[PDB]
């Protein structure tokens with residue numbers, strides 16, 4: 001593609017990314033740096049006040065279970081936001097419908113983890129559209145396997161945030177993830193990889209212009225897709241352990257279906 | 261950041277060392293595999309009897325073969341270790357980090373280079389004098405049948421990138437100098453080296469495959485496929501250690517797999 005076309009693709013994706021995701025990384029960074037203070041959850045009692053004063057709809061049973069399930073609720077919300085964003089990626093909706101479903105099915109976890117880093121620092125994570133802040137330490141100290149469920153996310157985020165990407169960078173990176181041609185069961189790989197090459201071209205030029213001093217940032221960001229795949233695999237295995245161990249997890253059958 | 265002429269110098273250096281360190285190059289392997297040559301033709305092993313005739317021309321069957329791969333993996337580690345010492349800056353790192361970069365890097369490199377010896381139907385063995393079919397491996401008993409097929413599945417996809425040896429010399433280097441390995445003491449000097457290696461690989465791929473659009477990015481995404489195969493392999497080994505009480509690993513391989 002010609003350079004002026006890549007910038008156009010980058011601008012298109014940035015605009016769409018702003019419309020699809022309410023809490024941007026720029027905004028999140030303002031809140032975390034202390035630059036209306038969020039409600040802070042750092043222990044059990046502040047949690048009990050947090051739901052009462054600000055209605056957390058992911059957390060309206062044991063506390064560590066409540067919190068785990070609340071993360072499920074929000075992940076379901078995020079999936080719909082990512083699905084709307086993907087439709088704005090040039091070429092996506094023209095793909096075979098089964099392939100569109102397949103790309104989203106296997107991609108959303110990688111994107112959720114990526115975008116969750118925009119809401120985290122080394123000390124905690126923004127929640128409920130940025131009105132709250134849950135500390136890392138409180139999450140880490142949740143009992144039995146739930147404590148060891150949240151920390152891998154922080155560990156990735158700390159490393160990922162060291163790249164210092166902004167929203168215009170992330171908009172293209174997110175697009176690149178969705179258009180992965182190696183997803184199982186794809187019917188027509190060719191147009192998927194063709195779009196990804198254009199997106200990779202766009203991301204490469206974006207990083208060079210926006211971070212001229214950051215040598216081989218393109219390569220370094222692509223290496224992070226190894227960290228994502230591995231963390232997604234780990235996550236899936238942790239779920240299986242909870243399903244086979246915890247007698248206290250069942251929800252309403254309808255809710256179980258929603259969270260399948 | 262480096263100058264273009266400096267990066268070409270680094271690529272030539274690494275290609276030269278790779279030729280010195282690895283006796284069975286991809287160019288040679290493909291000449292043997294593509295045939296048409298009466299002097300380089302391998303003996304083909306596809307079943308029990310030809311395996312038995314193979315020993316003339318070049319315990320239980322699956323163990324013998326598994327032990328054969330263990331032996332060759334040890335040799336490969338020795339070759340990779342020698343190559344790594346030639347990577348500018350590697351020998352100047354903290355010794356513990358040198359050991360750590362090799363601990364986690366050798367397998368990812370072994371599977372990369374094993375692809376050079378593979379096609380969809382089998383793999384070259386014994387310095388290219390032999391060829392073991394995929395199906396014969398897949399038909400070995402117990403957990404051994406399922407041991408090589410993941411590698412074949414990777415190689416088919418990886419070989420579709422059509423890299424040659426001069427490309428692989430830099431890619432192998434980029435893998436070793438990974439700053440995200442667990443337990444590294446000084447990540448920064450490792451990452452500075454990798455930046456120059458990545459710069460070198462980027463320019464090398466552009467010059468050597470000018471029509472192969474975004475080959476650089478596509479090659480880096482393959483480093484994800486490598487990580488998954490190493491995990492899968494290590495889990496299979498653990499199963500055998502708990503099932504075959506009489507079976508033994510090389511000290512070198514034994515230490516590599518500790519964590």
Ligand SMILES: O=C(O)c1ccc(-c2nn(C(=O)c3c(Cl)cccc3C(F)(F)F)c3cccc(Cl)c23)c(OCc2ccccc2)c1
Nearest residue numbers: 058067070071072074075078109112113116125127150153
């Ligand atoms: O605003 C957002 O975009 C967003 C994105 C991700 C998370 C989040 N997800 N998550 C997972 O376990 C997870 C992941 Cl990574 C990916 C896929 C599926 C899941 C899940 F298993 F939950 F189904 C977390 C684990 C630890 C910490 C967090 Cl913050 C998460 C999120 O939590 C909001 C929240 C947290 C606690 C209580 C109430 C709400 C918000």
